[PDB]
């Protein structure tokens, strides 16, 4: 669906409480 080639796709693929995001959201840490 995007405009990536094979090498680009390969490079892209190569890169409560108990949950990390849910616990970080309780202290103001937002992404």
């Amino acid at each position: 669906p995007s405009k990536r080639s094979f090498i680009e796709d390969l490079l892209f693929n190569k890169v409560a409480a108990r949950d990390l995001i849910c616990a970080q959201k309780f202290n103001g840490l937002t992404v």
Binding site: A16, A17, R18, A23, K25, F26, G28, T30
Partner: protein
């Protein structure tokens, strides 16, 4: 007629020293942004604000039901106690422990609670209540303290450094004294060793003083370690006997069933409400947990050292606590020089 409310007002002062402009920074996000930027001129952009915090609606206090009351007439108003070297120890449990009964009872002289406030004795729960009662002299009152001098605090009683308990002391000149000389209370005086915190000793052996071996002789340099007292209703205020009771208990540790007069009310979940459990107060939403606790624990924490799971002292169930403050609020403004139309965004 209007009722005033505590609001955060931003005032503008000119060169005349009088009030000219007032902004209510507690009604619209534009006023909040103006108060944050500390300037009436707002540029076009976006600014984050406070998180969406759900206001509490109810406050439940869950406590185990008690059907007994701790006796106070034989502890704070007894007719016969014991000595200081052999203090009477009692265990208090499965009863309602109150502290307001000390005002309408006997006339106490000293009352000090170390490690805990003297106003939260009825709201908090006590664990392993131990009452140590003894009788000392009026001049030995200051020696009874966590970390002091004197022979009473070294060879008789001993208090820990991090002691978290209460100590009461009341005079009893017309209860533990007589005109013919009172010799029913003895205290340790001669000893070649100290005492550990919360330790009892009733040794009646002959103390070895100096370089002369005693081994039972009762003579020179071989005095008795237990010396009698001299209570009589004829001396001054410094020689009158004083009954001292030390109440030692743990705060938030083992799941005890003592506590005080507080009992259970209702149980509401799926809402941001305040919850009180064993004295620990919190604000959040309760959810049916799935991981059970252990038969010796009450609270639960994680990597953030915060109470995440609580144990109900009624049906022995576990409930997870979730913060009801979730959501990032942002205000988008086109600038005060353009128009007045802000947009609210939730991330």
């Amino acid at each position: 007629v209007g009722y005033l409310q505590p609001r955060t007002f931003l005032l503008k002062y000119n060169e005349n020293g009088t009030i000219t402009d007032a902004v209510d920074c507690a009604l619209d996000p534009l006023s909040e942004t103006k108060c944050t930027l500390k300037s009436f001129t707002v540029e076009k952009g976006i600014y984050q604000t406070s998180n969406f915090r759900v206001q509490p609606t109810e406050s439940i206090v869950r406590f185990p039901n008690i059907t007994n009351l701790c006796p106070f007439g034989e502890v704070f108003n007894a007719t016969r106690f014991a000595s200081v070297y052999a203090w009477n120890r009692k265990r208090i449990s499965n009863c309602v422990a109150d502290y307001s009964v000390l005002y309408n009872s006997a006339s106490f002289s000293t009352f000090k609670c170390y490690g805990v406030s003297p106003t939260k004795l009825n709201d908090l729960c006590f664990t392993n209540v131990y009452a140590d009662s003894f009788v000392i002299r009026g001049d030995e009152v200051r020696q009874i303290a966590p970390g002091q001098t004197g022979k009473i605090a070294d060879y008789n009683y001993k208090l820990p450094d991090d002691f978290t308990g209460c100590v009461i002391a009341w005079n009893s000149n017309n209860l533990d004294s007589k005109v013919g000389g009172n010799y029913n209370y003895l205290y340790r005086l001669f000893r070649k060793s100290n005492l550990k915190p919360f330790e009892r000793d009733i040794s009646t052996e002959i103390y070895q003083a100096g370089s002369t071996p005693c081994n039972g002789v009762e003579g020179f340099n071989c005095y008795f370690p237990l010396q009698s007292y001299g209570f009589q209703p004829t001396n001054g205020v410094g020689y009158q006997p004083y009954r001292v009771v030390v109440l030692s208990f743990e705060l938030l540790h083992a799941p005890a069933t003592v506590c005080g007069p507080k009992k259970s009310t209702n149980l509401v979940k799926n809402k941001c409400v305040n919850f009180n459990f064993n004295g620990l107060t919190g604000t959040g939403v309760l959810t049916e947990s799935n991981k059970k606790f252990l038969p010796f624990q009450q609270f639960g924490r994680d990597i953030a050292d915060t109470t995440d799971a609580v144990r109900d002292p009624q049906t022995l169930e576990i409930l997870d606590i979730t913060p009801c403050s979730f959501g990032g609020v942002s205000v988008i403004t086109p600038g005060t020089n353009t128009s007045n139309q802000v947009a609210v965004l939730y991330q």
